[PDB]
C-alpha cells in the first residue's frame, strides 16, 4: 500500500488522488538562467499565474495535479508549496533529468549510479532538503533521438524505478521512433510497462502507430490538449474517442501540459500562437464533445480518476 | 578612467589592483545540479576551502584575485562576498556564458541580442541583484570547436565589450585551433586584441604556436600552473622564461586556475592526480626558478602587476 507525498510534505495514497490532471506544470524555467540573471524574471507574476491556473482547474473538480517539472526545467518544491497552500489542490512531484541531448559533466564523470542515487534520494528521503518526496520518475527523449547522455538518463530512471517501485512518466516525440526506444530500454532493464506512461503520444492521430505502443501494455499520454501546433484539438479529441471505441480505455491518460510560465519563449509569442492553451480546456471543450459522441460519464471518470490511481498502485 | 567593482560593491581602479592573480576560482559548481540536489554539497566546507586558499595567497602579497567563474560554472556574488569579507582580498567578478557545445533554449529562441543584453546588464547595473558589477567578459571554446552555440556566445562577448569597453578574458584549448577561432571572431567584430586574453595557452610549450597568437597583439594566459596533466610544471616555467627572453613580456599573464571546489570530479581523484595544484605554487616554485635563471624582480612585477593593470585600462 503506497504512500504519495504531496507538496507541503503531507501524504495521500492512490485511492484519494481523486480527479487528477496527470501532466501539467506550475512554472517551467531554466535553472542556469534564473540563477545567473534573476532580473529576467518576476517571482510574484509567476506565482500568481500558477495560482490562477490551478484555481481554474479546481473549479471543475480537480483535486490532484501532477507536476512534471523535474531537474533541468526548474523543479522547485518551495514554489510549489506556495501554490498548494493558496489553492488547496494536492500537488504531486517527481524526479529525473530533463534533456534532449546532454547531461552535466557532474554525472558523466561519476556514471549512471550517481544519477540513480540522486533520484533514489529524492524518492526515499526528500526533494531539495524538504520532506516532500518524489512519487514518480521521469525519462526524456526528443527529436535528437537516443544520444548517449539521453540513454544514460533514461536507464537511470528505469533503475530508480526498479529500486523504489515509483512509476515512470515520460516525454517522447512522435516524429521519430523515440517512443519505441523508451519501450526497448525499459524492457532491457526489467520494468513492468504497466507502471509507465509513454508521453506526448497525443501529438499523433495515427492509430496504427499508437496501437503499436498500446500493445506493449503501457499507458499513453494524450497529454497536450490545447497545444494545436503539433496536432489540432479536433484531431486530438477524435483520436481519444476512437481509442476508447477500439477497447483501449484502461491505458489512456489525459492532460494539457499547461505551463503558467515557460521561459523558453517570450510569453507574447506563446499567447498568440496557442491562445486556447489553459489548464481547463479538457473540461470546457474536450469532455462535452466526447459526451455528445456517446462517451459515458463513467468512461470519463475511468480515465481521469481510475487510470492515474492505477499508475500509482500496480 | 575606469572604475572596477569588487565583490561587496566597493570600487577600485586599475592602478590599485596591485599584485594580482588574473585567473582563479573560489568555487566551481554546476547550477542545475546544486539547485536540484543540494544534499550533494556542503556550503561550510566550500567556503572554508576558498577562504583558506585565498588567505594562503594573501600571505605572499596577493591583493587582487580575478574570479573567472561565470554563468554555467556557478557564479555566485553572495558566496564571493563572504570570501572577501573574511580575507580582505579584492575579488573581481565578470560575466559570460561558459559552455563547450550548447547554450540554453532561453537564448537560442531570443537570439544573440538577448545574451549581449544580459551581459551588458551585469556590467552596467549589477550581477544577481547586487551592486557588484562585472568588470570583464568571458568567452569559451574547447575541444568540440566552434559549434553554433559556442560561436554565438563568443560573438555576444565581443559585442558586450564593444558596448561597454571591459576586457575579454577567454578559455581556449591548445589541442586544436580554437585560439585562432577566437582571434578571427574578435577581429570580425572590431575588438582591439590588446583588450583580450587568449586563455590556457600555457598548456603548450610550442613556441611557434604561441608566437602566432602573440603576433596578433593579445595577451596570453599562462594560467594553469600546477595542473601538470596538460603540461608539466617544468615545461610551463621554461616556456615563460623563454617568452620573456624573446621579447614578449608585456603580453604575458600568469595564474593557477585554482579551484578550491570543483564539482565536475570527485575531490579525491583531483587531489591524487594534481597534488601540487594550489593558489600559491607560482610563489613557492615558479618565481624562484625564474629568478635563479636571471629573470629580475622588476620583470616579475611587470607581469603580475602591470600586465593585469594594463588589461583593465587600455
Ligand atoms: C514556436 C513558438 C511558440 C510555440 C509555442 C509552443 C509552446 C512550447 C510547449 C512546451 C512543450 C512542453 C514542454 C514539455 O513539457 O516537455
Ligand atoms: C582526469 C581526472 C582528474 C583530472 C583533474 C583535472 C582538474 C580539472 C581542471 C578544470 C579545468 C579548469 C576549468 C576551467 O577553468 O576552465
Ligand atoms: Co514533455
Ligand atoms: Co511537460
Ligand atoms: Co577555463
Ligand atoms: Co578557469
TrEMBL record, chains A, B:
Zn(2+) 1 binds at residues 23, 25, 138, 257. Gene3D superfamilies: Metal-dependent hydrolases (3.20.20.140). InterPro entries: AryldialkylPase_Zn-BS, Metal_Hydrolase, Phosphotriesterase. Binds 2 divalent metal cations per subunit. The keyword Transmembrane helix does not apply. GO terms for molecular function: hydrolase activity, acting on ester bonds; zinc ion binding. Zn(2+) 2 binds at residues 138, 171, 200. Keywords: Hydrolase, Metal-binding. The modification N6-carboxylysine is found at residue 138. Its cofactor is a divalent metal cation. The keyword Transmembrane helix does not apply. Pfam families: PTE (PF02126). SUPFAM superfamilies: Metallo-dependent hydrolases (SSF51556). PANTHER family: PHOSPHOTRIESTERASE-RELATED, PHOSPHOTRIESTERASE-RELATED PROTEIN. This is Parathion hydrolase. It comes from Vulcanisaeta moutnovskia (strain 768-28).
Amino acid at each position: 500500500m503506497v504512500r504519495i507525498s504531496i507538496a507541503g510534505g503531507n501524504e495521500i495514497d492512490p485511492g484519494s488522488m481523486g480527479l487528477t490532471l496527470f501532466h501539467e506544470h506550475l512554472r517551467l524555467i531554466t535553472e542556469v538562467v534564473r540563477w545567473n540573471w534573476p532580473h529576467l524574471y518576476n517571482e510574484d507574476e509567476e506565482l500568481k499565474r500558477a495560482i490562477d491556473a490551478v484555481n481554474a482547474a479546481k473549479k471543475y473538480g480537480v483535486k490532484t495535479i501532477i507536476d512534471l517539472t523535474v531537474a533541468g526545467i526548474g523543479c522547485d518544491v518551495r514554489f510549489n508549496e506556495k501554490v498548494a497552500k493558496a489553492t488547496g489542490v494536492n500537488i504531486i512531484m517527481g524526479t529525473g533529468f530533463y534533456t534532449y541531448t546532454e547531461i552535466p559533466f557532474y554525472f558523466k564523470n561519476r556514471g549512471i549510479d550517481s544519477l540513480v542515487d540522486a533520484f533514489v534520494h529524492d524518492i526515499t528521503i526528500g526533494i531539495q532538503g524538504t520532506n516532500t518526496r518524489a512519487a514518480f520518475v521521469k525519462a526524456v527523449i526528443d527529436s535528437s533521438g537516443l544520444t548517449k547522455d539521453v540513454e544514460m538518463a533514461i536507464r537511470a530512471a528505469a533503475k530508480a524505478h526498479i529500486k523504489t517501485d515509483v512509476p515512470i512518466i515520460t516525454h517522447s516525440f512522435v516524429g521519430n521512433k523515440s517512443s519505441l526506444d523508451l519501450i526497448r530500454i525499459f524492457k532491457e532493464e526489467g520494468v513492468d510497462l504497466a507502471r509507465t506512461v509513454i508521453g506526448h503520444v497525443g501529438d499523433t492521430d495515427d492509430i496504427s502507430f499508437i496501437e503499436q505502443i498500446l500493445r506493449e501494455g503501457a499507458f499513453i499520454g494524450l497529454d497536450r490538449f490545447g497545444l494545436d501546433i503539433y496536432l489540432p484539438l479536433d484531431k486530438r479529441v477524435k483520436t481519444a474517442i476512437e481509442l476508447i471505441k477500439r477497447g483501449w480505455i484502461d491505458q489512456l491518460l489525459l492532460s494539457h501540459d499547461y505551463c503558467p510560465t515557460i521561459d523558453w519563449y517570450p510569453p507574447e509569442v506563446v499567447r498568440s500562437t496557442v491562445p486556447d492553451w489553459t489548464m481547463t480546456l479538457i473540461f470546457e471543450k474536450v469532455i462535452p464533445r466526447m459526451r455528445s459522441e456517446g462517451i459515458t460519464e463513467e468512461q470519463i471518470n475511468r480515465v481521469l480518476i481510475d487510470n492515474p490511481r492505477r499508475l500509482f498502485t500496480g
